[PDB]
């Protein structure tokens, strides 16, 4: 948050730009054990806090009397420094991003899609899939998002 704030506030035009947080402040406690301790002896003590973020979420939102080109530069800098894959997007680039994914799902010439096979348990494939894979449809592997997967 310190990196996001100082970089955005230092790089924005306060007269013609505003910025709002789209994530809450750290609220999830994270415990750590004393250095050098062995396994066991009860859970460790609360150390710091974090905010969970899922793929497809807006982290920070900007607007004002600017175009996308004006903010895309330093929004990409802050995004590149985030602990996950992130990207500066616009009201328009976000929509075309979603139209392109739906266009690919429609013109896909492969008769075999992850979803079709996994929903019908074809090949008994669910013996290697998570229950979550019925809705993730092969686009998610842990915390990673794969925009190429259809």
């Amino acid at each position: 948050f310190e990196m996001m704030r100082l970089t955005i506030n230092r790089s924005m035009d306060p007269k013609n730009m505003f910025a709002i947080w789209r994530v809450p402040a750290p609220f999830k406690p994270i415990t750590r054990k004393s250095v050098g301790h062995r396994m066991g002896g009860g859970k460790g003590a609360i150390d710091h806090y974090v905010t969970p973020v899922k793929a497809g979420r807006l982290v920070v939102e900007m607007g004002g009397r600017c175009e996308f080109e004006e903010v895309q530069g330093f929004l990409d800098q802050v995004a590149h420094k985030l602990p996950f894959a992130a990207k500066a997007v616009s009201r328009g680039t976000l929509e075309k991003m979603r139209k392109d994914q739906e266009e690919r799902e429609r013109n896909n010439q492969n008769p075999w899609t992850f979803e079709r096979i996994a929903t019908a348990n074809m090949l008994g494939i669910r013996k290697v899939l998570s229950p979550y894979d019925l809705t993730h449809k092969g686009k998610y592997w842990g915390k990673f998002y794969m925009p190429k997967r259809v």
């Binding site: 929903t119 019908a120 348990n121 074809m122 090949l123 008994g124 669910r126 229950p131």
Partner: protein, 122 residues
């Protein structure tokens, strides 16, 4: 947790295109299935091992005939990844007491009631 799987019923709703590829008649469904196990039950959960035994499919590549009815289809749906299902075809009708001893189940799924082991004269 790995569990038994519910298959959406849409999976078993054939489309007009499917009838063209495979050549079934939705208005005149076949009576009997030909079912062949083509895949091991090793490395499969026990409940699939059990249904393969109920269907008489313990030996691979060994055609069993079964009724094309909802109860049997319920079992065949659980092990549909272990098996090949084909319709039984009776180009010459059912065997009769006369020709019970002359049938052959051909690879095309047709049960012929006359098996001469001779070349077709024409």
């Amino acid at each position: 947790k790995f569990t038994r799987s519910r298959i959406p019923e849409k999976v078993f709703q054939a489309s007009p295109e499917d009838h063209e590829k495979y050549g079934g008649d939705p208005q005149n469904p076949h009576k009997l299935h030909i079912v062949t196990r083509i895949k091991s039950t090793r490395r499969r959960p026990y409940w699939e091992k059990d249904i393969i035994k109920m269907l008489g499919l313990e030996k691979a590549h060994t055609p069993q005939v079964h009724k094309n009815i909802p109860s049997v289809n319920a079992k065949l749906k659980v092990v549909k990844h272990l098996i090949r299902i084909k319709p039984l075809k009776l180009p010459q009708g059912l065997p009769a007491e006369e020709n019970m001893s002359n049938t052959c189940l051909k690879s095309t799924g047709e049960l012929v009631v006359q098996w001469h082991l001779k070349p077709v004269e024409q």
